[PDB]
Design a protein around this motif. Structure first.
Motif, mmCIF file in Angstrom:
data_model
loop_
_atom_site.group_PDB
_atom_site.id
_atom_site.type_symbol
_atom_site.label_atom_id
_atom_site.label_comp_id
_atom_site.label_asym_id
_atom_site.label_seq_id
_atom_site.Cartn_x
_atom_site.Cartn_y
_atom_site.Cartn_z
ATOM 1 N N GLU A 295 85.862 90.652 -69.585
ATOM 2 C CA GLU A 295 85.898 91.865 -70.396
ATOM 3 C C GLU A 295 84.522 92.477 -70.452
ATOM 4 O O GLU A 295 84.336 93.641 -70.098
ATOM 5 N N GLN A 296 83.561 91.677 -70.906
ATOM 6 C CA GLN A 296 82.170 92.105 -71.033
ATOM 7 C C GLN A 296 81.705 92.810 -69.762
ATOM 8 O O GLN A 296 81.099 93.878 -69.830
ATOM 9 N N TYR A 297 82.007 92.205 -68.611
ATOM 10 C CA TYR A 297 81.651 92.738 -67.294
ATOM 11 C C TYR A 297 82.290 94.101 -67.076
ATOM 12 O O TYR A 297 81.628 95.065 -66.714
ATOM 13 N N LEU A 298 83.593 94.167 -67.299
ATOM 14 C CA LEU A 298 84.319 95.403 -67.118
ATOM 15 C C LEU A 298 83.724 96.536 -67.954
ATOM 16 O O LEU A 298 83.463 97.616 -67.424
ATOM 17 N N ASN A 299 83.483 96.309 -69.243
ATOM 18 C CA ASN A 299 82.903 97.377 -70.058
ATOM 19 C C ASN A 299 81.530 97.735 -69.509
ATOM 20 O O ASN A 299 81.023 98.832 -69.734
ATOM 21 N N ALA A 300 80.939 96.793 -68.782
ATOM 22 C CA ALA A 300 79.613 96.958 -68.195
ATOM 23 C C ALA A 300 79.639 97.767 -66.913
ATOM 24 O O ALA A 300 78.780 98.610 -66.691
ATOM 25 N N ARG A 301 80.622 97.506 -66.066
ATOM 26 C CA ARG A 301 80.713 98.211 -64.804
ATOM 27 C C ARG A 301 81.337 99.587 -64.985
ATOM 28 O O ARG A 301 80.778 100.606 -64.563
ATOM 29 N N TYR A 302 82.492 99.619 -65.636
ATOM 30 C CA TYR A 302 83.208 100.870 -65.794
ATOM 31 C C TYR A 302 82.871 101.770 -66.964
ATOM 32 O O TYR A 302 83.104 102.974 -66.893
ATOM 33 N N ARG A 303 82.309 101.218 -68.030
ATOM 34 C CA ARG A 303 81.982 102.039 -69.193
ATOM 35 C C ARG A 303 80.494 102.091 -69.476
ATOM 36 O O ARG A 303 80.050 102.759 -70.408
ATOM 37 N N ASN A 304 79.726 101.383 -68.659
ATOM 38 C CA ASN A 304 78.275 101.345 -68.799
ATOM 39 C C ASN A 304 77.819 100.772 -70.145
ATOM 40 O O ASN A 304 76.793 101.198 -70.675
ATOM 41 N N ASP A 305 78.567 99.808 -70.683
ATOM 42 C CA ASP A 305 78.230 99.198 -71.966
ATOM 43 C C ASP A 305 77.757 97.757 -71.793
ATOM 44 O O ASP A 305 78.463 96.926 -71.219
ATOM 45 N N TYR A 306 76.553 97.477 -72.291
ATOM 46 C CA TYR A 306 75.955 96.140 -72.224
ATOM 47 C C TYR A 306 75.684 95.587 -73.629
ATOM 48 O O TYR A 306 74.974 94.595 -73.795
ATOM 49 N N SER A 307 76.263 96.239 -74.634
ATOM 50 C CA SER A 307 76.112 95.845 -76.030
ATOM 51 C C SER A 307 76.796 94.519 -76.323
ATOM 52 O O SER A 307 77.580 94.020 -75.525
ATOM 53 N N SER A 308 76.489 93.958 -77.486
ATOM 54 C CA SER A 308 77.095 92.715 -77.948
ATOM 55 C C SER A 308 76.993 91.520 -77.008
ATOM 56 O O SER A 308 78.010 91.043 -76.485
#
Ligand SMILES: CCCCCCCCCCCC[N+](C)(C)[O-]
Ligand SMILES: CCCCCCCCCCCC[N+](C)(C)[O-]
Lengths: 477, 477
Positions: A295-308
């Motif tokens: 999940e963390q990765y996906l929000n990172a690749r596709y949504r540009n989110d590295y929070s939390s």
């Protein structure tokens, strides 16, 4: 073709002007063609009107709908369509595809994650995981314990307590992560494939197995082959007797995102569980700055989110009923720290004692909890003495949410044997001039159809009416 | 003529320059002439030298010294001289005068108030009440449990934990206020007279009695006739069985201070106690803005201090030893609120489990506590796994005091059967570049004379040596 509807609707006015509407619904369609069906739908519509602006937020989706069929002879079930991964080793993400997965000693499986907290008003409580709606119906003011969750819930849940005065208090609960253990002869496994959803979608396979070593021990492993994201995990599990079961897991990750860099990390997790057939569970988890979940990765690749970025996570659960001095005690705690942001400690405690002082079952209950009200911590405590008076019961309640304390007097009467009930309450909020509170809550609980309405009104405050129906029907033309 | 000396001495240097000295002593002289003696003395001297300034704070006093004599035939004891009032209904102040006061079922008397907490270093811990020194000797780093207190301690205590690095952490503990109950035939009472001390001193008498109604119940009352300060209190007490004992008290006050005004107030107090021969105690107290204790009044009249107006006070204590899964659990909590200043929540918890994994008694212990470091909250946690290795025992410790965490490795060896022991430790402090820690603690515990020395040194930090002797001698020429 079965249907399992769940509806909510609430209307309210402000003392300053505003009206607002709130309608939500979620449920599941079921069908039988050894080809079984399951479709989860959820939607909501909200509107508000103030001095100048009306606003509307409207949403609908099929969280997940898939076909699944049992097979005689590998004691395994095959499921294909849009689902969510449920693993005892990995964390959850949603996906389209199919999966093949392996009733046996309870001491090794998972149980219903009972969520608890406290509400200022008669509030609608919604429990979710990712975006999926697990529970959302109304609750009468005071401590609340939602024990309606699907037998298979896993991971941590998102709870939102939307109060009748317009205050949204939110928190998090971690469901117990019971040790992935097995009996020597048997083998537990879970091999899933497809593409990750909702951000066509990266292709991925994932496998997880539980071997039965010849001792009261057992070893398990699993892997995630997502391409740009891979993770491998191995773990040792040990069974005891009544002193519960235990296990530990080490899991490493490799994530490669474009022109961003490449992350490596591991996380260790120790979990103990003494429940079977008093339940107690304590879990620990500590993960590296660069370790990421699917999940963390996906929000990172596709949504540009590295929070939390998770650091350490402690979680304790104790629901022990001492029938002995007629008192139950429940504790739900979960401390969680990060590498990038501030610690987040969520907890809720309660102790209920049943007395005899004058006739039977006079009740005193103390509850305390802490959630979040808009970034800031919200800290509550509740004191309730209830005196049963025939089919009815009169009670006095003292609430303390942050700096605002409420005093409440009320009579509740039940009928149809506990199926239906009706209670009227009146009180005072002080903490800022005081206000008188008037509130009535009615509930009907037949097994094929539930329904509940309530009306509340605060002085120089708000005034709202809400209904909440949930039942079972067959929709086949 | 008996003597009960208690000594402490410590010397230390800074990495920036400074030296400092610390010597303290307290003890009691006893004598027998049916005329008995008791003299409590306490004193200390501290010196420091920095760039330019040496400083010295030196103090000595006889806290209290009085004559007391037993009487055959009213089962009462008479005591006269300089003492402190000890009441089960009122709070404490010091006084010169005499008093006449009434071994019987433990379920009605008071027990030893065990104080607990956590120390960063090898620290000297001093426990006091008002100004009187109840305990002050050294403790080896890690959780600590002082169980050396006089059988008769009452009220709340002041604890100061002066660490080897120069950090003074302070907190408060409330001793259990056991229900002033009696057996029907007997009568408990306490009638005291004199003038209040240490601010000649206002004249005052005070009486307190406990009647034995014919049920498992009992009523008690008391009054304080101080002139400008008067207070009356009545209370109901009830006895049970093993589910402990209980009681409630209402107490009103009238205080008249010059050109200041006149205060009126009451305070209600509910206390439950399930200890006898697992101990559990929970107490509550809520007092009015204008209600004052004899002490509060005195600081008000003679020192012009009106600070610390008590509002609500909760206090819980649970020390339950489940020999069953070989684990002990101790909880000391005390929430306290005011009308003029901020809330003050002090607590300390610990759970110790004894294992078997490879040979006997491998030990894991978790402790958590919160005190005050200079107005600001100081929050600690401690994790210790100890492996016994013959007459010795090796251990690993993880400390987390605020934002500074310490890792420790160490071996401790005991001899003379547990009477003497010697341990060496080495570790790392990180939370600000890290530092290496070297520390050794030696203890000798013979029943007629105790003695203990320890040496500690932090990298780019401090370096100190400390000794602490305490024994019994007869000083008669
Ligand atoms: C009848 C077996 C049920 C299907 C089980 C699916 C597991 C196969 C995984 C292989 C890779 C799937 N993939 C590459 C499309 O992700
Ligand atoms: C032999 C009895 C022992 C003395 C008990 C003292 C209680 C008498 C109190 C009366 C008032 C004393 N006063 C007025 C000086 O405070």
């Amino acid at each position: 073709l079965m249907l399992d509807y769940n509806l909510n609707g609430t209307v309210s006015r402000n003392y300053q002007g505003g009206d607002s509407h709130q309608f939500s619904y979620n449920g599941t369609v079921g069908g039988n063609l050894p080809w079984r069906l399951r479709a989860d739908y959820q939607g909501s519509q909200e509107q508000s009107r103030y001095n100048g602006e009306k606003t509307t937020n409207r949403n609908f989706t099929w969280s997940r709908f898939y076909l699944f069929r049992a097979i005689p002879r590998w004691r395994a079930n095959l499921t294909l369509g849009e689902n969510n991964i449920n693993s005892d080793i990995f964390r959850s993400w949603s996906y389209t595809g199919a999966s093949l997965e392996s009733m046996l000693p309870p001491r090794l499986r998972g149980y219903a994650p009972q969520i608890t907290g406290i509400a200022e008003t008669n509030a609608r409580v919604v429990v979710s995981q990712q975006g999926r709606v697990l529970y959302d119906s109304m609750v009468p003011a005071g401590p609340f314990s939602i024990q309606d969750l699907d037998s298979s819930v896993r991971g941590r849940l998102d709870v939102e307590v939307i109060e009748q005065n317009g205050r949204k208090k939110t928190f998090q609960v971690d469901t117990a992560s019971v040790p992935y253990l097995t009996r020597p002869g048997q083998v537990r496994y879970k091999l899933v494939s497809g593409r990750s959803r909702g951000y066509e979608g990266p292709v991925f396979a994932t496998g997880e197995a539980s071997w039965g070593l010849s001792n009261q021990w057992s070893l398990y492993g699993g892997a995630v082959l997502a391409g740009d994201y891979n993770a491998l995990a191995a773990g040792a599990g040990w069974d005891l007797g009544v002193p519960g079961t235990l296990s530990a897991d080490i899991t490493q990750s490799v994530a490669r995102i474009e022109g961003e860099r490449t992350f490596q990390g591991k996380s260790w997790r120790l979990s103990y569980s003494k429940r079977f057939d008093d339940i107690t569970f304590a879990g620990y988890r500590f993960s590296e700055r660069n370790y990421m979940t699917m999940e963390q990765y996906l929000n990172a690749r596709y949504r540009n989110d590295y929070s939390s970025r998770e650091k350490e996570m402690y979680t304790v659960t104790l629901n022990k009923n001492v029938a002995d001095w007629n008192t139950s005690f429940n504790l739900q705690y979960s401390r969680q720290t990060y590498w990038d942001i501030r610690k987040t400690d969520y907890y809720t405690v309660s102790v209920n004692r049943y007395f005899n002082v004058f006739l039977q079952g006079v009740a005193v209950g103390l509850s305390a909890s802490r959630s979040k009200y808009l970034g800031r911590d919200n800290d509550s405590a509740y004191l309730r003495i209830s005196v049963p008076l025939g089919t009815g019961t009169a009670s006095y309640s003292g609430s303390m949410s942050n700096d605002r304390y409420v005093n409440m007097a009320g009579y509740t009467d039940t009928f149809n044997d506990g199926l239906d009930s009706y209670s009227l309450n009146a009180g005072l909020n002080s903490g800022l001039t005081s206000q008188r509170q008037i509130n009535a809550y009615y509930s009907h609980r037949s097994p094929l159809a539930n329904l509940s309405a309530n009306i509340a009104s605060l002085q120089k405050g708000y005034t709202s009416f809400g209904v909440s129906a949930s039942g079972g029907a067959t929709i086949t033309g």
